[PDB]
Amino acid sequence: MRPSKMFCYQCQETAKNTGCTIIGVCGKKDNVANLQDLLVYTVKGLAVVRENLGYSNDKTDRYIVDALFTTITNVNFDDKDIIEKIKEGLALREEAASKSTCPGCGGDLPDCATWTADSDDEIIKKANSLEVSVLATENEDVRSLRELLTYGVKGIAAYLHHAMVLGYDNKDIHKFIRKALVATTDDSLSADELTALVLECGKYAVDTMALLDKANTETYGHPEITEVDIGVRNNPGILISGHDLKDLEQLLEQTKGTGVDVYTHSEMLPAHYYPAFKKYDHFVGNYGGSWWRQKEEFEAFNGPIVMTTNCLVPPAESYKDRIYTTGVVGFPGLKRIPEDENGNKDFSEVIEQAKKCAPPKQLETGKIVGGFAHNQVLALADKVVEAVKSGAIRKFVVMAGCDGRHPSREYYTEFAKKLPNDTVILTAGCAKYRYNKLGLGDIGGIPRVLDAGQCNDCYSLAVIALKLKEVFELDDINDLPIAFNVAWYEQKAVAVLLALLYLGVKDIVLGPTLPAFLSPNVAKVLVEKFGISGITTVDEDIERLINK
């Protein structure tokens, strides 16, 4: 018997930092949360069956990453979509089971690999069962490690999805996803074995971020130094949000010559840094701030909005008629832009709607500079190294990650403003919006905020650090003049954290709170072995991270 209507604690904003049990803080309703649990459960069973067969296939690999992405915070609020995804997994699982060479193994299989439902009512009943809840794992340390691994796997799945959209893949990462999912169903594993899998999850997060970096840069060019306008023009626009650059490619192609401008929002900002998008005259600039302001900013934008990934907030009535979903995003009543047989998407109706809209309300004017991904920073290596050797740059501070609504996040704005003028902030992901419009200036022409791109472009920050480690002949990445004060919100940030731990980064400050899914004993290991700490006050953290 489920002790509460739902249980979800996978993001930074979980209620009281102990768990959403009646309705999600994000707006995810109990029935949706329980259906998402059943979707994860169904994916775990599908992984068990594929591991029994000994191999997977492309349609199953894509399904598994897409189904996991469907359950990431702020992606899909639509119970109908989640039910359809559950049924798709059951059909793929039954297909796989029909190809089994050892079907006598059925009775030894965990329930997630064999459960069935003969009706939508039986699906809902199963979704409401205790066995599909996150709380089904009874020991709190085993639960903590399984959930941490699972959320790291969701983050891998999101980034892998984007690589696959662009025609890139790595079947070893999919093999790891299945292995990890199976492990969370395996009561024979010890906590040490789960701990090893969490570390291996960081290794595969590096590999996945490397693959997505290859996909984005081979397709659209290497990011380069770019000034991005944050004001508006006088034409109707379409605002594109989330992370998917292929969606933008098609939107820009289809709006060329139409009189409809295109603007980016939140994690679409880094598209401006890629040469393939810079080429379009009607690609205007970046509108507003990070995802949590979107109810106000999407209304002010006046034109249609295309949400390619998270973060989607349950929309205000004022713009519900002009916000569209795509990819795995969903919300009841929002129309979707589906892929055709080739993965092409048709924005014609969004464009015809945009022609009838007022132009965007100006929220601000000016320009921000960005595009300091790994190729661009490597081209500046002599200048960066010279600034380090002279002490013009005494310390880099990685403040990358993912913003959110909690006002405690003011810490990051105040921290950025109080840093001394001989430090440089390295950023990526929407955490940047706490400090990327502050006018912090430059050090000998190197901006004091260096934006490498989306949260996945934390990969570039790791590559830059590893290059500086090589240049300075250090044998420990932590011997660089670098500090980490990272903000997190959902599961892609968890995968980024694990990647950093796997790469050997110690003493990360993680905030503005520590995840609810760390049990006391698990958090103890992160503190004592990896040096993780939470934020305190700006002055104390400036002192410990910068001046000592």
- Span interacting with Mg ion, options 149-157, 332-340, 355-363, 432-440, rule CB under 5 A: 332-340
Q: Which does 469 bind (CB under 5 to 8 A by kind): ligand SF4, Mg ion, none?
A: none
Task: Establish if 79 lies at the interface with Mg ion (CB under 5 A).
Answer: yes
Q: Report the nearest approach of ligand SF4 to the CB of residue 190 (Å).
A: 28
The 3-state DSSP class for residue 166 equals coil
- Tell the smallest beta-carbon distance from residue 453 to ligand SF4 (Å): 24
Residue 464 corresponds to which amino acid? I
Does 120 bind Mg ion (CB under 5 A)? Our answer is: no
Tell me which H or E stretch contains 427: strand 423-427
Residue 357 interface partner, choices Mg ion, ligand SF4, none, CB cut-off 5-8 Å depending on type: none
Q: Which two tokens stand for residue 283?
A: 């690609």
**CA dist 382 to 78, 228, 254, 379, 481, Å?**
51, 25, 41, 8, 17
Beta-carbon count within 10 A of 345 CB: 22
Give the helix, strand, coil percentages of the chain, each rounded to 5: 50, 10, 35
Run of H or E including 337? strand 336-337
Choose one: 46-54, 74-82, 288-296, 340-348; the region binding Mg ion (CB under 5 A): 74-82
By a kind-dependent CB cut-off of 5 to 8 A, residue 11 interacts, out of ligand SF4, Mg ion, none, with ligand SF4
Least distance to ligand SF4, CB of residue 27, Å: 7
Say what angle helices 30-53 and 171-183 make with each other, to 10 degrees: 110
Tokens found for residue 297 = 């900013």
- Report CA Rg, the chain: 23
Closer by beta carbon to ligand SF4, 13 or else 244: 13
Q: Taking the alpha carbons of 402, 512, 25, 153 in that order, is the dihedral positive or negative? A: positive
| Options 71-79, 160-168, 316-324, 506-514: segment touching Mg ion (CB under 5 A) | 71-79
Q: How far is the CB of 13 from ligand SF4 (least distance, A)?
A: 5
Nearer to ligand SF4, 311 or 545 (CB): 311
- Answer yes or no whether residue 261 interacts with Mg ion by CB under 5 A: no
Q: Which residue has the tokens 């990462």?
A: 173
* Closest to Mg ion by CB, 79 or 147: 79
CB of 348 to ligand SF4, least distance (A): 34
Phi, psi values for residue 323, rounded to 5°: -110, 130
Using the minimum distance from each CB to Mg ion, give the nearer residue, 31 or 375: 31
Q: How far from each other are the two terminal CA atoms of the chain, in whole angstroms?
A: 52
66 sits near Mg ion (criterion: CB under 5 A): no
Give the residue among 490, 321, 358, 485 at the shortest CA–CA distance from 419: 485
> Which residue carries 């093999």 as its tokens?
175
Q: Which helix (H) or strand (E) holds 442?
A: strand 442-443
Binding at 8: pick from ligand SF4, Mg ion, none (beta carbon under 5-8 Å per type): ligand SF4
Minimum separation from the CB atom of position 9 to ligand SF4 (A):
5
Nearer to ligand SF4, 26 or 240 (CB): 26
417 binds, among Mg ion, ligand SF4, none (CB under 5 to 8 A by kind): none
How many residues bind to Mg ion according to rule CB under 5 A? 3
Q: Which is nearer to ligand SF4, 8 or 142 (CB)?
A: 8
Q: What is the dihedral of CA 14, 20, 26, 30, to 10 degrees?
A: 160
Least distance in angstroms from the C-beta of 16 to ligand SF4: 10
In the list ligand SF4, Mg ion, none, the entry touching 10 (Cβ below 5 to 8 angstroms by class) is ligand SF4
> Residue 81, interface with Mg ion (CB under 5 A)?
no
CA 306 – CA 322 distance, rounded (Å) = 9
Decide whether 2 or 322 has the Cβ nearer to ligand SF4: 2
- CB of 88: closest distance to ligand SF4 in angstroms? 22
Closest contact distance (angstroms) between CB of 362 and ligand SF4 is: 32
Q: How far is the CB of 257 from ligand SF4 (least distance, A)?
A: 41
* Closest CB to ligand SF4 among residues 28, 162: 28
Chosen from ligand SF4, Mg ion, none, partner binding at 167 (C-beta under 5 to 8 Å by type): none
- In the complex with Mg ion, the residue whose CB is nearer, 94 or 120, is 120
Nearest distance, CB of residue 76 and Mg ion, angstroms: 11
Measured at the CA of 258, the angle between CA 257 and CA 263, to 5 degrees, comes to 95
Binding residue for Mg ion, selected from 167, 259, 275, 332, defined by CB under 5 A: 332
Q: List residues near ligand SF4 by CB under 6 A.
A: 8-11, 13-14, 20, 24-26, 28, 33, 73
Beta bridge partners of 239: 263, 305
d(CA 399, CA 535): 12
The residue (of 106 and 332) whose beta carbon lies closer to Mg ion is 332
**371: number of Cβ within 10 Å:** 24
Looking at the Cβ atoms of 90 and 523, the one nearer to ligand SF4 is 523
Asked if 360 contacts 300 with a C-beta cutoff of 8 angstroms, the reply is yes
Could you give the count of Cα atoms lying within 13 Å of 345 in the half-sphere of its Cβ? 25
| Cα angle 20-147-136, degrees, rounded to a multiple of 5 | 70
Q: What are the b/e assignments for 254-274, b being 16+ CB within 10 Å?
A: bbeebebbbbbbbbbbbbbbb
Residue number with the smallest Cβ distance to ligand SF4: 24
Q: Is 28 or 432 the residue whose CB approaches ligand SF4 more closely?
A: 28
Residues forming beta bridges with residue 426, ordered by sequence position: 398, 450
Answer with the entry of ligand SF4, Mg ion, none that 332 interacts with (C-beta below 5 to 8 A by kind). Answer: Mg ion
Closest CB 80 distance from ligand SF4, rounded Å: 19
Distance CA(213)–CA(219), nearest Å, equals 10
Given a contact cutoff of 8 angstroms between Cβ atoms, the answer to whether 405 and 13 are in contact is yes
Binding footprint of Mg ion on the chain (CB under 5 A): 79-80, 332
